[PDB]
Amino acid sequence: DDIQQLLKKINELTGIKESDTGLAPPALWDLAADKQTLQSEQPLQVAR
Amino acid sequence: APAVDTAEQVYISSLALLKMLKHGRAGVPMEVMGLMLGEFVDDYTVRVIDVFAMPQSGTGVSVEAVDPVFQAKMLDMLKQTGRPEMVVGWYHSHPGFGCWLSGVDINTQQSFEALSERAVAVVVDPIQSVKGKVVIDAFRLINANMMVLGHEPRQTTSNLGHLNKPSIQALIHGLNRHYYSITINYRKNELEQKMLLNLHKKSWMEGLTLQDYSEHCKHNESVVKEMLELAKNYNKAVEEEDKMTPEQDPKRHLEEHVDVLMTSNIVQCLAAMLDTVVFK
Amino acid sequence: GNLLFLACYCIGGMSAIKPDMKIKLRMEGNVNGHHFVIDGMDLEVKEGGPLPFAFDILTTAFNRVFAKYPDNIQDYFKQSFPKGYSWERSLCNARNDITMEGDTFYNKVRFYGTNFPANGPVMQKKTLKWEPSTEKMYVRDGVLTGDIEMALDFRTTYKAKEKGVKLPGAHFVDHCIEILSHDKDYNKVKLYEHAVAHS
Ligand SMILES: [Zn+2]
């Protein structure tokens, strides 16, 4: 019983970790232009 | 550099608020808009004395929805009547969308602010304005250079600008990032309030008209029967009180029925006998 | 034959939402050979990559903004709001249009030109600067014509949508427009539009 309880203890405490989103390496970022596109360009729904 | 104080208020007149609500509802589910006239009394006051609607256009609510001919002629002829107030700002209705400014709303507000730095963009939700609460807000803007430099949009000198809390719905739609909410106060003098009081001011007559006596007796019968059932429940509950240490109430309902009975019958008796003795 | 089959049911959830329609401040032109379109005051050419001509030939065509006027000089630019002012610019000609195409508030600054010299100084991309230029603004036939000399003729005409605003007297507004920041390919540009009125 203690072995099972400790196993669940480790499982809940070990966590999740990343969960690392698709972030490009720096110096490839044009955050200014990215914001410009966000505030300027618009999405389009596709259709048949 | 001068900064707009957070204590600045928008004093909307009673007439302006009523016209704004009526026009906003009349255009549901479309978004209607119009111009608010008034005066910038000082750096901390924007008085909206009156607001006139504008003809609906298929564009929606944009800077192309202000027909120059309509605005100019309306202003000229109002000035003839005696209302020579400048165009303080503009208003439009977000039916069920809450109070905030969209990208195009921010755009038209930039256009208006180019006319005068002080200019408000009050919006009103006409279907969320159910009797009681009125869902309406007023926003100006934040200059982009002001925000990017890190300085706060508005200087603060009092608690007036923070008595009310911003809404989440407005906050996600850009509040405190591109536009700031301006506190709204309603200028209601005694005369306007007394005039509005006539809406439900009953009469000099219904103070003297007795209830339909058969209807009165039937109501008395029904309430007394309900009160009998409630008394049975009250007795049953009180018997439990004894065999129960400190650990809907048939009593509270009983008290409410008693109060309604006494008020109804006392009023009916007194009105009846006042009638007997004032009418010969 | 004796099939008599039941029927199941698989629903498909369906919904969408129109966002806040986004104003794209884009200019278009076909001055010499290329249908260049630029978004923008940071400038970025959308289509019509590295220009066969210099940028300056089109930098003068750049609502929502107006020159600074003193209290003595009537600010036709300012009081023409909220609607704004529409102008015809003659260099090559330029006009500003406000349209509702799609879900974008289009503030077109549509450009157009002709009579491009085969070795004119506008296409070799040579450029020093634009020296401060004074526009004499005056009314000819009910239209606010601004005559400006180009130094590096301009016959600007400004008409307000509110055709009731009084016409200011003939004054001399000094414009100082220079290409502040850019790249060699001229695809990431920052423009300066400073201009003050002078009586
Ligand atoms: Zn809106």
Curated annotation (Swiss-Prot), chain A:
Induction: Expression is not cell cycle-dependent and occurs throughout the cell cycle.
Processing after translation: Monoubiquitinated by RNF181. Phosphorylated. Dephosphorylated by UBLCP1 which impairs PSMC2 ATPase activity and disrupts 26S proteasome assembly.
Cellular location(s): Cytoplasm
Domain of life, per lineage: Eukaryota
Subunit composition and interactions: Component of the 19S proteasome regulatory particle complex. The 26S proteasome consists of a 20S core particle (CP) and two 19S regulatory subunits (RP). The regulatory particle is made of a lid composed of 9 subunits, a base containing 6 ATPases including PSMC2 and few additional components. Interacts with NDC80/HEC; this interaction is detected only during M phase. Interacts and SQSTM1. Interacts with PAAF1. Directly interacts with TRIM5. (Microbial infection) Interacts with HIV-1 Tat.
Functional note: Component of the 26S proteasome, a multiprotein complex involved in the ATP-dependent degradation of ubiquitinated proteins. This complex plays a key role in the maintenance of protein homeostasis by removing misfolded or damaged proteins, which could impair cellular functions, and by removing proteins whose functions are no longer required. Therefore, the proteasome participates in numerous cellular processes, including cell cycle progression, apoptosis, or DNA damage repair.
Family statement: Belongs to the AAA ATPase family.
Protein name, per record: 26S proteasome regulatory subunit 7
Range of the intact protein held here: 50 to 97 of 433
Swiss-Prot record, chain B:
GO MF terms held by the record: endopeptidase activator activity; K63-linked deubiquitinase activity; metal ion binding; metal-dependent deubiquitinase activity; metallopeptidase activity; proteasome binding
Function: Component of the 26S proteasome, a multiprotein complex involved in the ATP-dependent degradation of ubiquitinated proteins. This complex plays a key role in the maintenance of protein homeostasis by removing misfolded or damaged proteins, which could impair cellular functions, and by removing proteins whose functions are no longer required. Therefore, the proteasome participates in numerous cellular processes, including cell cycle progression, apoptosis, or DNA damage repair.
EC numbers: 3.4.19.-
Modified residues (Phosphoserine): 129, 203
Protein name: 26S proteasome non-ATPase regulatory subunit 14
Phylogenetic lineage: Eukaryota, Metazoa, Chordata, Craniata, Vertebrata
Cross-referenced InterPro entries: JAMM/MPN+_dom (IPR000555), JAMM_MPN+_peptidase_M67A (IPR050242), MPN (IPR037518), RPN11_C (IPR056263)
Residue ranges constituting the MPN domain according to the UniProt record: 10-145
Family per similarity comment: Belongs to the peptidase M67A family. PSMD14 subfamily.
Binding locations of Zn(2+): 92, 94, 105
GO CC terms, sorted: cytosol; cytosolic proteasome complex; extracellular region; ficolin-1-rich granule lumen; nucleoplasm; nucleus; proteasome accessory complex; proteasome complex
Signal peptide per UniProt: none
Position of sequence motif JAMM motif: 92-105
